[PDB]
Amino acid sequence: SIIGSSIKTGATSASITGGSDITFALTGQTVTNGLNVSVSEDTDYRTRRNATFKSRVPTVVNGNYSKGKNEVVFVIPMSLDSGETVFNSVRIALEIHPALASASVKDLRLIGAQLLTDADYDSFWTLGALA
Amino acid sequence: SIIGSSIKTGATSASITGGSDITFALTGQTVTNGLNVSVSEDTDYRTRRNATFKSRVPTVVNGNYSKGKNEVVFVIPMSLDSGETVFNSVRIALEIHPALASASVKDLRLIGAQLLTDADYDSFWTLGALA
Amino acid sequence: SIIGSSIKTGATSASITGGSDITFALTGQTVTNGLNVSVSEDTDYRTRRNATFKSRVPTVVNGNYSKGKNEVVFVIPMSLDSGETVFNSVRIALEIHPALASASVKDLRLIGAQLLTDADYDSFWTLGALA
Amino acid sequence: SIIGSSIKTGATSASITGGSDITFALTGQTVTNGLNVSVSEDTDYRTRRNATFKSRVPTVVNGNYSKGKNEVVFVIPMSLDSGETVFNSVRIALEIHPALASASVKDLRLIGAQLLTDADYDSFWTLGALA
Amino acid sequence: SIIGSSIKTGATSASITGGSDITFALTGQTVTNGLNVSVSEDTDYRTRRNATFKSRVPTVVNGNYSKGKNEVVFVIPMSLDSGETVFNSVRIALEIHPALASASVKDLRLIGAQLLTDADYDSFWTLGALA
Amino acid sequence: SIIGSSIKTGATSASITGGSDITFALTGQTVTNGLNVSVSEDTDYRTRRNATFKSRVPTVVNGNYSKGKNEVVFVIPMSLDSGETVFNSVRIALEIHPALASASVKDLRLIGAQLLTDADYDSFWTLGALA
């Protein structure tokens, strides 16, 4: 279902037919080049979904610029039966050279979002199935 | 607009209002535990957009499981004025522990894709703006 | 009057019948994982009252959490007759394990603040009196 | 909410709109320069809230006096799911040079209490949020 | 024009009759003792105007205070016909001893600004004239 | 207050609603590549405000120009309780490459002046705040 899948490029926008809200607040977990915001709507810190935003800037090397990198890491911590608590992590990193078109940047955001949420990729994401 | 942003958990589904289709086909670029599919709709091999799916399953070691990891990377190549061709990357990795709920797996997929597209973060991704 | 003193747990709130306001503003004195705010209402830099907020979040290590620590220190500087300026300190640290109830966190804040102000301990703080 | 917060100085007194009483009795835990009193109103020793009072006196060094230090440590012990029991600790230490005004000492007690209990600082104390 | 120039001291406030707005957002470039905010309104990072704020607070040596230093640097980047990209700088550093009058501090800010924006100095700033 | 501040670019001109005049006359202090003009209106040299103007023109290396540098430093001298006399400084240095737009030069002058004299930055300049 990965091979021969179809996804929209240059989409006008994307949206979500969704359920309840969730709201971020500042965590004050020291994070270099970024922020930590957790959801103040979960009641138990030991399992509060949080998210970390990072932004590395392009490097100026003798008139040549490297691509920059903007990461987000969203985390669901869960307490195992063993007592050891672990982390379920969705990470999305977007690396862009400044010379790319402002429109292609947003096309890239939306095409990644489709790669996450489309049904064609359900087997891949959930089961790990290649091809 | 990161601090205080609001997104949806337990969404029924996500969708996209957008333009033209793009179709994938298998590339055969060797990728370990993975798969390269490029678009058959772009014509120039230099600038032909391609994605790569890597997959690693939860493996049991010493009686208990290790969280598994499913990466995707979608790439827009562009030739720079200097001659070197550089890649523009969006990379989405998703690491799940086997104990997570089937429903919370899709909640992670949708809450991650919602961090790319939702206008609240629109200033973050484009401008690299921490606020 | 320590032995046998009585204070309130699960208080709805605490309040203060008192005089003039004092307003804080950011100082920029470098404080690691922290923040210096001094009063903009005192005028002399020598004797200008200032507070410092340090914050350390619960960090997971080897599958489980470590209790976090939030310090404050409020300082009244005074110049001594000998010339050396000395600081007068009230320091309030609060260490919470993530498993504590949200309500018991505020119960700790109020039961601690009630140990400063309640007249039973009034002889302890002023006179350094153990009884 | 820490930056630009307002608190009362030279307050006449502070109080607590509160719930049920709690009473301290002598613990006989050997504590240097101080006492241990636990609440005889909790029924299970393994989780009896206790408090420890310490008083270090000013040091006389050739006509010069160091500030003295009066600590209180209030502790909620809690039994984890792991079986290991840990301690939730509010600690309040007040360091005063004897030459400070008797009125400024009590202003310092009350200003620390406000720093604990005011709503402006809820985010800081609970979440660990700086600024 | 520099010799004999007249500028207002003890001014109430300064203003600017001008054109379009520009807004700053936090860059996420790591700066020692400092901050980087760039222009959220310029669309190409390669030429995004940005400002960097450094701050050092007065340091005390055995009762004697040192004048502190607040720097700002504002940069217009431009790429040359050489391909090399050069930074066009304006840097304003204000060094104040704590004992200075609160109003003399703001008089220094305003008198510095007049030294940039009065016509008497146009020849100096633009060309480098020393009369 | 620094993050999110708004300031005018492409401004026509800046002005100052202010108090009394002050006039400069040539000091006759020898300054390399520079000039010293002090205040003809302060009566005691010991505390006469003075300004020093330095200038370096763009230098050409085999056809390539170097950004030139125009410095100004303005000084309020004050004698301390120590007897020691310290200089209170504001220093503005404008470094321009010859290829920059004539109007962008004056826009830099005006935007630098706004960075001193806008309210958004009061906390930064006076105290040293970095937010």
Strand order of the largest sheet of chain A: 3-4-5-8-9
| Count of alpha and pi helical runs of chain A | 2
Largest sheet of chain A: 5 strands, antiparallel
Largest interface: A-B, 79 and 79 residues
Structural class of chain A: alpha+beta
Q: Strand percentage of chain A, roughly?
A: 35-45%
Q: Give the assembly state of these chains.
A: part of a larger assembly
Order of helices and strands of chain A: EEEEEEEEEHH
Distance between the termini of chain A: 7 Å
Radius of gyration of chain A: 18 Å
PDB class: virus like particle
Keywords: virus, virus-like particle, structural protein, virus like particle
Entry title: Virus-like particle of bacteriophage GQ-907
Chains A, B, C, D, E, F: coat protein
